[PDB]
A paper describes a structure:
DING is a family of proteins with molecular mass of approximately 40 kDa, with a conserved N-terminal sequence of DINGGG.
To enable further study of DING proteins, an E. coli expression system for HPBP was constructed. The chemically unfolded rHPBP was refolded by the dilution method. The refolded rHPBP was further purified by chromatography, and the final yield was 43 mg per litre of culture. The structure of rHPBP was determined at a resolution of 1.03 Å. The revealed structure was well superposed on the native HPBP with r.m.s.d. of 0.04 Å for 327 Cα atoms. A phosphate ion was captured at the identical site to native HPBP, with identical residues participating in recognition. Based on these observations, it was concluded that rHPBP was correctly refolded to the native structure.
Residue numbers in the entry: 1 to 376
Write the structure that this text describes.
Protein backbone atom coordinates (compact mmCIF):
# COMPACT_ATOMS: atom_id res chain seq x y z
CA UNK A 1 0.00 0.00 0.00
CA UNK A 2 0.82 3.65 -0.60
CA UNK A 3 1.11 5.43 2.76
CA UNK A 4 0.30 9.08 3.39
CA UNK A 5 -0.72 11.43 6.14
CA UNK A 6 -0.07 14.85 7.61
CA UNK A 7 -2.34 17.91 7.65
CA UNK A 8 -5.57 17.52 9.62
CA UNK A 9 -7.30 20.45 7.87
CA UNK A 10 -8.25 18.22 4.85
CA UNK A 11 -8.19 14.85 6.62
CA UNK A 12 -11.93 14.22 6.33
CA UNK A 13 -11.72 14.91 2.61
CA UNK A 14 -8.91 12.38 2.16
CA UNK A 15 -10.80 9.86 4.31
CA UNK A 16 -13.90 10.13 2.11
CA UNK A 17 -14.34 6.93 0.07
CA UNK A 18 -12.82 7.10 -3.42
CA UNK A 19 -11.09 10.47 -3.05
CA UNK A 20 -7.83 8.53 -2.77
CA UNK A 21 -7.78 5.84 -5.44
CA UNK A 22 -6.66 2.20 -5.57
CA UNK A 23 -3.54 1.30 -3.62
CA UNK A 24 -3.78 4.17 -1.13
CA UNK A 25 -3.93 3.26 2.56
CA UNK A 26 -6.24 5.35 4.75
CA UNK A 27 -4.90 8.87 5.32
CA UNK A 28 -3.38 9.49 8.75
CA UNK A 29 -4.02 12.98 10.12
CA UNK A 30 -1.24 14.12 12.46
CA UNK A 31 -0.55 17.76 11.51
CA UNK A 32 1.46 19.34 8.70
CA UNK A 33 4.70 19.49 10.68
CA UNK A 34 4.63 15.74 11.19
CA UNK A 35 3.54 15.19 7.59
CA UNK A 36 6.58 17.04 6.30
CA UNK A 37 8.97 15.11 8.57
CA UNK A 38 7.31 11.83 7.62
CA UNK A 39 7.85 12.44 3.93
CA UNK A 40 11.19 14.28 3.94
CA UNK A 41 12.94 11.83 6.25
CA UNK A 42 10.84 8.73 5.45
CA UNK A 43 9.72 8.50 9.07
CA UNK A 44 6.52 6.50 9.37
CA UNK A 45 6.88 6.87 13.15
CA UNK A 46 5.20 10.29 12.75
CA UNK A 47 2.10 8.39 11.53
CA UNK A 48 2.14 5.31 13.77
CA UNK A 49 4.22 2.65 15.45
CA UNK A 50 4.63 0.27 12.48
CA UNK A 51 7.94 1.64 11.26
CA UNK A 52 8.54 -1.14 8.73
CA UNK A 53 6.18 0.89 6.52
CA UNK A 54 7.57 3.51 4.17
CA UNK A 55 6.05 6.95 3.65
CA UNK A 56 5.00 7.77 0.08
CA UNK A 57 3.27 11.14 0.31
CA UNK A 58 2.03 13.80 2.70
CA UNK A 59 -0.68 16.38 3.03
CA UNK A 60 0.51 19.76 4.28
CA UNK A 61 -0.87 23.26 4.56
CA UNK A 62 2.61 24.39 5.64
CA UNK A 63 4.95 25.18 2.76
CA UNK A 64 8.26 23.38 2.49
CA UNK A 65 11.02 25.66 3.77
CA UNK A 66 14.29 26.49 2.02
CA UNK A 67 16.16 24.22 4.44
CA UNK A 68 13.69 21.36 3.97
CA UNK A 69 13.96 21.59 0.19
CA UNK A 70 17.77 21.89 0.15
CA UNK A 71 18.23 18.99 2.54
CA UNK A 72 15.94 16.73 0.49
CA UNK A 73 17.69 17.74 -2.74
CA UNK A 74 21.09 16.86 -1.29
CA UNK A 75 20.19 13.76 0.76
CA UNK A 76 17.26 12.05 -0.94
CA UNK A 77 16.77 13.32 -4.50
CA UNK A 78 19.77 11.50 -6.04
CA UNK A 79 18.32 8.11 -5.08
CA UNK A 80 14.60 8.87 -4.84
CA UNK A 81 14.00 11.54 -7.48
CA UNK A 82 12.69 15.09 -7.15
CA UNK A 83 9.98 15.86 -4.68
CA UNK A 84 6.76 17.37 -5.97
CA UNK A 85 4.78 19.95 -3.98
CA UNK A 86 1.41 20.94 -5.47
CA UNK A 87 -1.80 22.54 -4.26
CA UNK A 88 -4.56 20.05 -3.53
CA UNK A 89 -7.55 22.31 -2.82
CA UNK A 90 -8.15 25.88 -1.70
CA UNK A 91 -9.68 26.74 1.63
CA UNK A 92 -10.98 29.47 3.87
CA UNK A 93 -9.92 29.69 7.49
CA UNK A 94 -13.07 29.79 9.64
CA UNK A 95 -13.52 31.45 13.03
CA UNK A 96 -15.92 29.28 15.07
CA UNK A 97 -16.78 30.34 18.61
CA UNK A 98 -18.91 29.36 21.59
CA UNK A 99 -20.88 32.37 22.81
CA UNK A 100 -24.67 32.55 22.92
CA UNK A 101 -26.55 35.45 21.35
CA UNK A 102 -29.19 36.08 18.70
CA UNK A 103 -27.04 38.68 16.94
CA UNK A 104 -24.69 37.83 14.09
CA UNK A 105 -21.03 37.94 15.04
CA UNK A 106 -19.31 39.81 12.24
CA UNK A 107 -15.66 40.63 12.90
CA UNK A 108 -13.94 43.53 11.26
CA UNK A 109 -10.36 42.61 10.44
CA UNK A 110 -9.26 45.10 13.13
CA UNK A 111 -11.45 43.28 15.69
CA UNK A 112 -10.13 39.87 14.59
CA UNK A 113 -6.60 41.18 15.07
CA UNK A 114 -7.46 42.46 18.55
CA UNK A 115 -9.03 39.18 19.61
CA UNK A 116 -5.99 37.18 18.58
CA UNK A 117 -3.45 39.68 19.96
CA UNK A 118 -5.19 39.96 23.32
CA UNK A 119 -6.04 43.64 22.90
CA UNK A 120 -9.74 42.74 22.88
CA UNK A 121 -10.39 40.52 25.90
CA UNK A 122 -14.16 40.91 26.21
CA UNK A 123 -16.97 40.09 23.77
CA UNK A 124 -18.36 43.61 24.34
CA UNK A 125 -15.50 44.86 22.15
CA UNK A 126 -17.10 43.28 19.08
CA UNK A 127 -19.48 45.86 17.67
CA UNK A 128 -22.98 44.63 16.90
CA UNK A 129 -22.50 41.17 18.40
CA UNK A 130 -24.72 41.77 21.43
CA UNK A 131 -22.35 39.72 23.58
CA UNK A 132 -20.36 40.46 26.73
CA UNK A 133 -17.92 38.57 28.92
CA UNK A 134 -14.40 37.14 28.56
CA UNK A 135 -13.00 35.85 25.28
CA UNK A 136 -10.78 32.78 25.53
CA UNK A 137 -8.56 31.90 22.57
CA UNK A 138 -8.00 28.25 21.64
CA UNK A 139 -5.01 27.56 19.40
CA UNK A 140 -3.04 24.64 17.96
CA UNK A 141 -0.31 23.39 20.29
CA UNK A 142 1.70 21.73 17.55
CA UNK A 143 3.23 22.59 14.16
CA UNK A 144 0.14 23.31 12.08
CA UNK A 145 -0.52 24.34 8.50
CA UNK A 146 -3.81 25.88 9.63
CA UNK A 147 -1.68 28.07 11.90
CA UNK A 148 0.57 28.96 8.96
CA UNK A 149 -2.40 29.94 6.77
CA UNK A 150 -3.93 31.98 9.61
CA UNK A 151 -0.75 33.74 10.78
CA UNK A 152 0.07 34.62 7.18
CA UNK A 153 -3.18 36.61 7.19
CA UNK A 154 -2.49 38.18 10.59
CA UNK A 155 1.02 39.13 9.43
CA UNK A 156 -0.39 40.85 6.35
CA UNK A 157 -3.41 42.58 7.89
CA UNK A 158 -2.88 43.13 11.63
CA UNK A 159 -0.77 46.24 11.17
CA UNK A 160 -1.89 48.43 14.09
CA UNK A 161 -1.59 46.15 17.12
CA UNK A 162 1.05 46.91 19.76
CA UNK A 163 3.02 43.93 18.43
CA UNK A 164 3.11 42.12 15.10
CA UNK A 165 2.36 38.54 14.08
CA UNK A 166 5.07 36.48 12.41
CA UNK A 167 4.18 33.77 9.90
CA UNK A 168 4.65 30.44 11.67
CA UNK A 169 3.33 26.93 12.16
CA UNK A 170 3.41 27.41 15.95
CA UNK A 171 0.80 29.92 17.08
CA UNK A 172 2.50 30.46 20.45
CA UNK A 173 5.50 31.89 18.55
CA UNK A 174 3.56 34.26 16.28
CA UNK A 175 2.84 37.48 18.17
CA UNK A 176 5.98 39.48 18.91
CA UNK A 177 4.89 40.12 22.51
CA UNK A 178 4.01 36.46 23.03
CA UNK A 179 0.82 34.85 24.33
CA UNK A 180 1.18 36.59 27.69
CA UNK A 181 -1.26 39.40 26.76
CA UNK A 182 -3.91 36.68 26.41
CA UNK A 183 -5.61 35.44 29.57
CA UNK A 184 -6.00 31.67 29.82
CA UNK A 185 -5.46 30.84 26.15
CA UNK A 186 -5.82 27.08 25.60
CA UNK A 187 -3.61 24.86 23.41
CA UNK A 188 -4.98 21.69 21.82
CA UNK A 189 -3.71 19.11 19.32
CA UNK A 190 -5.24 18.59 15.87
CA UNK A 191 -8.23 20.21 14.23
CA UNK A 192 -10.37 17.77 16.20
CA UNK A 193 -8.69 18.54 19.53
CA UNK A 194 -9.23 22.26 19.07
CA UNK A 195 -12.90 21.75 18.18
CA UNK A 196 -13.37 19.50 21.21
CA UNK A 197 -11.94 22.26 23.41
CA UNK A 198 -14.11 24.88 21.69
CA UNK A 199 -17.22 22.75 22.24
CA UNK A 200 -16.40 21.69 25.81
CA UNK A 201 -19.51 22.47 27.87
CA UNK A 202 -17.74 21.82 31.19
CA UNK A 203 -16.18 25.28 30.96
CA UNK A 204 -17.76 28.72 30.67
CA UNK A 205 -18.77 30.07 27.27
CA UNK A 206 -16.48 32.47 25.46
CA UNK A 207 -14.02 30.39 23.46
CA UNK A 208 -12.98 31.28 19.92
CA UNK A 209 -10.50 29.77 17.45
CA UNK A 210 -9.31 29.50 13.83
CA UNK A 211 -10.23 26.34 11.96
CA UNK A 212 -10.53 24.23 8.83
CA UNK A 213 -13.99 24.95 7.38
CA UNK A 214 -14.63 21.17 7.22
CA UNK A 215 -14.29 21.03 11.03
CA UNK A 216 -15.70 24.44 11.98
CA UNK A 217 -19.33 23.31 11.73
CA UNK A 218 -21.08 19.91 11.56
CA UNK A 219 -22.42 20.62 8.04
CA UNK A 220 -21.92 23.22 5.29
CA UNK A 221 -25.06 25.09 6.34
CA UNK A 222 -23.53 25.60 9.79
CA UNK A 223 -20.77 27.78 8.33
CA UNK A 224 -23.47 30.37 7.58
CA UNK A 225 -24.76 30.46 11.17
CA UNK A 226 -23.15 33.65 12.48
CA UNK A 227 -24.18 32.83 16.03
CA UNK A 228 -21.59 30.02 15.87
CA UNK A 229 -19.16 30.79 13.03
CA UNK A 230 -18.10 34.41 12.68
CA UNK A 231 -18.49 36.45 9.56
CA UNK A 232 -15.28 38.33 8.78
CA UNK A 233 -14.92 41.57 6.83
CA UNK A 234 -17.25 44.05 8.54
CA UNK A 235 -16.32 47.62 7.72
CA UNK A 236 -16.99 50.64 5.57
CA UNK A 237 -16.20 50.83 1.86
CA UNK A 238 -16.76 53.99 -0.19
CA UNK A 239 -18.50 55.57 2.79
CA UNK A 240 -21.03 52.75 3.13
CA UNK A 241 -21.14 50.14 5.89
CA UNK A 242 -20.50 46.63 4.60
CA UNK A 243 -21.13 43.27 6.24
CA UNK A 244 -18.49 40.57 6.48
CA UNK A 245 -18.90 37.19 4.82
CA UNK A 246 -19.17 33.63 6.08
CA UNK A 247 -16.24 31.27 5.41
CA UNK A 248 -18.40 29.25 3.01
CA UNK A 249 -16.35 28.16 0.00
CA UNK A 250 -18.52 30.28 -2.33
CA UNK A 251 -17.13 33.36 -0.57
CA UNK A 252 -13.49 32.59 -1.42
CA UNK A 253 -13.85 30.87 -4.82
CA UNK A 254 -13.72 34.08 -6.89
CA UNK A 255 -10.43 35.12 -5.31
CA UNK A 256 -8.93 31.66 -5.87
CA UNK A 257 -9.90 31.58 -9.55
CA UNK A 258 -7.53 34.45 -10.43
CA UNK A 259 -4.45 33.26 -8.52
CA UNK A 260 -1.64 33.33 -11.09
CA UNK A 261 -0.11 30.05 -12.28
CA UNK A 262 3.38 29.12 -11.07
CA UNK A 263 6.04 30.76 -13.26
CA UNK A 264 6.59 28.37 -16.18
CA UNK A 265 10.38 28.66 -16.30
CA UNK A 266 10.66 27.78 -12.60
CA UNK A 267 8.21 24.85 -12.47
CA UNK A 268 11.10 22.54 -11.53
CA UNK A 269 11.22 24.44 -8.23
CA UNK A 270 8.61 23.04 -5.81
CA UNK A 271 8.47 26.38 -3.98
CA UNK A 272 6.71 28.18 -6.85
CA UNK A 273 3.85 25.68 -6.95
CA UNK A 274 2.20 26.85 -3.73
CA UNK A 275 0.91 30.42 -3.90
CA UNK A 276 0.94 32.44 -0.72
CA UNK A 277 -1.19 35.43 0.02
CA UNK A 278 0.11 38.72 1.38
CA UNK A 279 -0.62 42.41 1.85
CA UNK A 280 0.05 43.36 -1.76
CA UNK A 281 0.46 41.61 -5.11
CA UNK A 282 4.00 41.31 -6.45
CA UNK A 283 7.01 39.01 -6.64
CA UNK A 284 4.89 35.87 -6.70
CA UNK A 285 2.82 36.91 -3.70
CA UNK A 286 -0.95 37.26 -4.23
CA UNK A 287 -2.79 40.05 -2.42
CA UNK A 288 -5.44 38.99 0.09
CA UNK A 289 -8.77 39.79 -1.59
CA UNK A 290 -10.68 42.99 -0.85
CA UNK A 291 -13.98 41.25 -1.60
CA UNK A 292 -15.54 38.01 -0.37
CA UNK A 293 -14.26 36.19 2.70
CA UNK A 294 -10.78 37.52 3.49
CA UNK A 295 -8.89 34.59 5.07
CA UNK A 296 -7.91 31.96 2.53
CA UNK A 297 -5.07 29.80 1.22
CA UNK A 298 -4.05 26.44 -0.19
CA UNK A 299 -3.53 23.01 1.28
CA UNK A 300 -1.01 20.89 -0.57
CA UNK A 301 0.30 17.47 -1.53
CA UNK A 302 3.90 16.32 -1.32
CA UNK A 303 4.83 13.35 -3.51
CA UNK A 304 7.91 11.87 -5.17
CA UNK A 305 8.47 12.02 -8.92
CA UNK A 306 9.86 8.48 -8.69
CA UNK A 307 8.83 5.27 -6.94
CA UNK A 308 10.89 2.07 -6.97
CA UNK A 309 7.73 0.00 -7.38
CA UNK A 310 6.07 0.23 -10.80
CA UNK A 311 2.59 -0.65 -9.54
CA UNK A 312 2.78 2.13 -6.95
CA UNK A 313 3.99 4.51 -9.67
CA UNK A 314 0.94 3.76 -11.79
CA UNK A 315 -1.38 4.08 -8.80
CA UNK A 316 0.04 7.50 -7.92
CA UNK A 317 -0.46 8.58 -11.54
CA UNK A 318 -4.07 7.33 -11.43
CA UNK A 319 -4.66 9.44 -8.33
CA UNK A 320 -3.25 12.55 -10.03
CA UNK A 321 -5.39 11.81 -13.09
CA UNK A 322 -8.49 11.89 -10.89
CA UNK A 323 -7.59 14.70 -8.47
CA UNK A 324 -6.48 17.00 -11.32
CA UNK A 325 -8.81 15.69 -14.03
CA UNK A 326 -10.92 17.88 -16.29
CA UNK A 327 -13.70 15.40 -15.52
CA UNK A 328 -14.15 12.20 -13.47
CA UNK A 329 -12.48 14.10 -10.66
CA UNK A 330 -12.80 14.80 -6.93
CA UNK A 331 -14.43 18.21 -7.22
CA UNK A 332 -17.87 17.20 -5.89
CA UNK A 333 -16.23 15.62 -2.83
CA UNK A 334 -13.99 18.66 -2.39
CA UNK A 335 -17.03 20.94 -2.32
CA UNK A 336 -18.98 18.61 -0.03
CA UNK A 337 -16.19 18.97 2.54
CA UNK A 338 -16.24 22.78 2.52
CA UNK A 339 -13.27 23.33 0.20
CA UNK A 340 -12.72 25.04 -3.15
CA UNK A 341 -11.62 23.01 -6.17
CA UNK A 342 -8.54 24.18 -8.04
CA UNK A 343 -9.37 26.26 -11.12
CA UNK A 344 -9.15 24.51 -14.49
CA UNK A 345 -5.95 26.28 -15.51
CA UNK A 346 -4.31 25.08 -12.29
CA UNK A 347 -5.44 21.49 -12.91
CA UNK A 348 -4.05 21.72 -16.44
CA UNK A 349 -0.72 23.05 -15.19
CA UNK A 350 -0.37 20.27 -12.62
CA UNK A 351 -1.14 17.65 -15.28
CA UNK A 352 1.23 19.17 -17.83
CA UNK A 353 4.23 18.99 -15.49
CA UNK A 354 3.52 15.95 -13.36
CA UNK A 355 1.41 13.63 -15.51
CA UNK A 356 2.19 14.21 -19.19
CA UNK A 357 4.73 11.46 -19.83
CA UNK A 358 7.02 13.50 -22.09
CA UNK A 359 7.61 16.16 -19.42
CA UNK A 360 10.89 15.88 -17.52
CA UNK A 361 8.97 16.47 -14.27
CA UNK A 362 6.38 13.74 -14.81
CA UNK A 363 5.72 11.04 -12.24
CA UNK A 364 7.36 7.81 -13.36
CA UNK A 365 9.19 9.41 -16.30
CA UNK A 366 11.24 6.49 -17.62
CA UNK A 367 14.31 8.56 -18.47
CA UNK A 368 14.41 10.34 -15.11
CA UNK A 369 13.25 7.57 -12.81
CA UNK A 370 15.50 4.99 -14.47
CA UNK A 371 16.88 3.01 -11.52
CA UNK A 372 15.53 5.40 -8.90
CA UNK A 373 12.63 6.05 -6.57
CA UNK A 374 11.23 5.95 -3.06
CA UNK A 375 11.02 2.51 -1.45
CA UNK A 376 7.79 0.54 -1.62
Amino acid sequence: DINGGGATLPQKLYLTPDVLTAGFAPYIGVGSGKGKIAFLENKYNQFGTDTTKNVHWAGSDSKLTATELATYAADKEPGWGKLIQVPSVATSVAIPFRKAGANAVDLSVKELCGVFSGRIADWSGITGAGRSGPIQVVYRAESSGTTELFTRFLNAKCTTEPGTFAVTTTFANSYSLGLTPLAGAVAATGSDGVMAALNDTTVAEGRITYMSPDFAAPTLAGLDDATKVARVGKGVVNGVAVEGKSPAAANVSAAISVVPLPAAADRGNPDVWVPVFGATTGGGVVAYPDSGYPILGFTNLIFSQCYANATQTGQVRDFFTKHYGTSANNDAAIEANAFVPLPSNWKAAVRASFLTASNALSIGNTNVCNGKGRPQ
